[PDB]
Every structure is written in C-alpha cells, then in structure tokens.
C-alpha cells in the first residue's frame, strides 16, 4: 500500500496520516529521520487498546499501525495516540474512519465521438470491488497537447459514471482521465490517483 501512502505523504510532510481503503481497514502512519514508539487507541467508549507498530525505511524511517479489523467502526470517534518510549507524547488525533477514505483509481476508461459535433462521451467503471458505488463522486480531467495542458475539469455528481464533454476544438488530440472519492456528507477523504488516461483525436468541423 506504499503507493497510496506516498501519495498521501506528499500532502503532509510530518503529520500523522490515516486512511481507509474499503472501510474494513485503517492505516495510520508517519515518517521520521531512530526512535521507539507505542500506538494507543480508543474506539468510542470502549477501553483503550494498543496497536502493533511496524516500521520500514523509505527513500527516512516510516512507522505505521494497521488497526485491527474488529475495531474498524465508522461513524464513531476513534481517538488516536502516538507516544514515545520515554513517555513523551508525539501525536494525538480524533478521527472518523468514514471521513478518511482513499479509494483506488477508476478503471475502464473509454472515449467516443458523440452526435453533436464537438462533443465526446466518456464512460468509465468505478474502482474494482469498492463498497457503495452510488456514493462515489468523480472528477474528469481534459488535457490538450501542444503545451496547453489541462483545459477542463468537470465535477461529476455522485453515482454517475458517464460524462458528455462540450466545446472541444477539432483536429486536436485530447487526453482524458478520471479520479474518484467518497461523497459528502456521510463520507470524506482524499482524491484517488488518476485513472489510466485515454486519448482521442477530433476531426474537422463541417
């Protein structure tokens, strides 16, 4: 899961980062440049427990806690606490698992020339085996060549998996890409990685 970690580790230099992938798991991690630490948590009103803390070096060392599946309850306050071996405190967060979701990248992107000239119809599939697909909202990126870059970003409402793009110049090679995230207000998290892009060339205008 290093890819998602590094993606999230960009948005945060030295903070305790937590995220869930399929709502039945939770990973909290942080990076340092050595030390010994203990990870304690409290699910709602249940007694405090400890999490087995793993560690591995990154290009420097990264500590992460993979929370036990049995305590992966959403919609309830999960108090987190990272404490050093010397007893000195380090981190302290009260998160909700349903508010830190990091889905996989959407797949099956295909582009087609629509009916109205200058229009392209995008169709894609939600991330493979992802819970509650109708609560996933998307974002489509339209990039043009010749140094133009991103020319359009359309926000797709939750549940919809098709997008009809308008105002596209002919004889131009566009490149489309989609990313996903869980929708408000019963969820929250971070944008997924961009899907494998799909290009399409428009013909001339008659």
């Amino acid at each position: 899961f290093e890819s998602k970690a590094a993606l999230l580790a960009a948005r945060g230099p030295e903070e305790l980062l937590c995220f869930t992938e399929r709502l039945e798991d939770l990973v909290c991690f942080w990076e340092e440049a050595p030390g010994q630490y203990s990870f304690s948590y409290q699910l709602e009103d249940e007694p405090w427990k400890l999490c087995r803390l793993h560690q591995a070096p990154t290009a420097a060392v990264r500590f992460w806690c993979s929370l036990p599946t049995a305590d992966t309850s959403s919609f309830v306050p999960l108090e987190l606490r990272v404490t050093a071996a010397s007893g000195a405190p380090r981190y302290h967060r009260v998160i909700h698992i349903n508010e830190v979701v990091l889905l996989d990248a959407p797949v099956g992107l295909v582009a087609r020339l629509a009916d109205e000239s200058g229009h392209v119809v995008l169709r894609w599939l939600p991330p493979p085996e992802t819970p509650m697909t109708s609560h996933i909202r998307y974002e489509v990126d339209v990039s043009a060549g010749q140094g133009a870059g991103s020319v359009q970003r359309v926000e797709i409402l939750e549940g919809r998996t098709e997008c009809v793009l308008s105002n596209l110049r002919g004889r131009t090679r566009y490149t489309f890409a989609v990313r996903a995230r869980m929708a408000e207000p019963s969820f929250g998290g971070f944008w997924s990685a961009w899907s494998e892009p799909v290009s399409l060339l428009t013909p001339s205008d008659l």
Partner: antibody, heavy 124, light 111 residues
Framework: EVQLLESGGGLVQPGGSLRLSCAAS????????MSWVRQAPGKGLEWVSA????????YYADSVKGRFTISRDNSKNTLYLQMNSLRAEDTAVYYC?????????????????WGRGTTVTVSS | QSVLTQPPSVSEAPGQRVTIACSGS????????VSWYQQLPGKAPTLLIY???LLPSGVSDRFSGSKSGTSASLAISGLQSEDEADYYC???????????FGGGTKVTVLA
C-alpha cells in the same frame, strides 16, 4: 467456522419470564459486539437489543426497555438476554447475531453471523 | 409494518431472472449501506449482499445487488430450486436511531 448456539426460551404465559443464552465459538468473543434480532410472522426482523465488546455500552428497542436486559460473559463466551414481563407481541424467533465490529451501530454496515435461533412462545 | 418495503411473494420459472425491490426513504436506503440476507427454510439467515453492490466471499455469482436513490434491488439470475428461500433487506436509519428491515420476500420456484 463461526458458530452461535441459542438456548432457553419455550412456551410461557403473559407476565412470564425467560433467560436466553448464546454459546459462541469460532472467534474471539470479547473483540466483537453482539445483538439480538427477533423474527415474528408478518413483523419481519427487529433489532431487539445489542451490547458492546466490553459490555460497557448497551442498546434496547423502545418496546423492550425496562423489561429486557442484555449481558455477556467474556470468560465463558456467552451472550444472555433476561426477558421479564413478557407480552403476547414478544412471540418470535430470537436470533443471536454477531456484529462486524466492537460496537454495534451505524458503523457496522451489516450483521456478520446469525445463529439457528430459539423460539419464544407467549400464549394462554 | 416494516420501514423498508418488500414484495411479500415472488414466483418465477427455473433458469429465469428475479428482481426483488426494497423501497425506503432518504433516512434509510438514501444515505446508508444496504445489506441483503438469505434465509433458507428452517435454517439460519446468511449474509447475501453487503455494501449495496458488493458480494461476500462464498456467495454465488448469480446474486447481485444494486441501488438507485431510495430503493435497493436484489437480482437472482439463472434461478434454481435451491434458491427457494426468504430474502430480507436491511439498512441503518438516521431519523430513527436503529436498524430497520424489510418485510421479507419469499421466492418460489415453479417447475
């Protein structure tokens, strides 16, 4: 793998009392929460009561408050349901249901394992 | 009655396709995870479909779940006689603060 065995309950009269028991095995009992779900004909399933992993937090339906009492023994891997002041409408099949997480509620998303279920009959 | 609404009985010929509706509101199915349960006659209810559309490990490929607005659906393609049972839909409610279930649907298979 997971096994839940209900016991207790039978035929009684209005005002009677019973004590249901769930013999749990195949998983770490004290790490998960448990629930009681009853099935009356024409009433479908109903969430009767539920208790957390440590037993600190408890929930009761509005129709069984004060008459029912849920509890658990983590040392014996057993879930209890103390039923007092029974009424005619309490007549249903009571299922022992294991929750997905340590606290039963919205964040559970679904009920994990059910039991064979014991029947509670209340009539004259 | 039940907060969630299912058709009481559904009959269909073997090998065909069966659709079981489960209508609710904006407080139940609208913004909460729907789960489906199968109860074979005289046996314990089993987890059939969770997370609206996901399929539990061990459940036949013939079962599939979908969700549109305030109504969820269970699909049984390639209907067999072994599938003859009772199917319940369940979801959390936010107006009320507990689990709600459907009346249940008894799928009957002809010959």
């Amino acid at each position: 793998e997971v096994q839940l065995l209900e016991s207790g309950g039978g035929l009684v009269q209005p005002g009677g009392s019973l004590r249901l028991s769930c013999a749990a095995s195949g998983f770490t009992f004290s790490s998960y929460a448990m629930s009681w779900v009853r099935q009356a004909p024409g009433k479908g399933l109903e969430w009767v009561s539920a208790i957390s992993g440590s037993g600190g937090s408890t929930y009761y339906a509005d129709s069984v408050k004060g008459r029912f009492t849920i509890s658990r023994d983590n040392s014996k891997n057993t879930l209890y349901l103390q039923m007092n002041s029974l009424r005619a409408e309490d007549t249903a099949v009571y299922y022992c249901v294991k929750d997905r997480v340590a606290v039963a509620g919205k964040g559970s998303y679904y009920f994990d394992s059910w039991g064979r279920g014991t029947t509670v009959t209340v009539s004259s | 009655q039940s907060v969630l609404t299912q058709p009481p009985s559904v009959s269909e010929a073997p090998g065909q396709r069966v659709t079981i509706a489960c209508s609710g509101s904006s407080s139940n199915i609208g913004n909460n995870a729907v789960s489906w349960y199968q109860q074979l006659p005289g046996k314990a209810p089993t987890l059939l479909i969770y997370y609206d559309n996901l399929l539990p490990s061990g459940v036949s490929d013939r079962f599939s779940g979908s969700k549109s607005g305030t109504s969820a659906s269970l699909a049984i393609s390639g209907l067999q006689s072994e599938d003859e049972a009772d199917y319940y839909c369940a979801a959390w409610d936010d107006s009320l603060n507990d689990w709600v279930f459907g009346g249940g649907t008894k799928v009957t298979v002809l010959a």
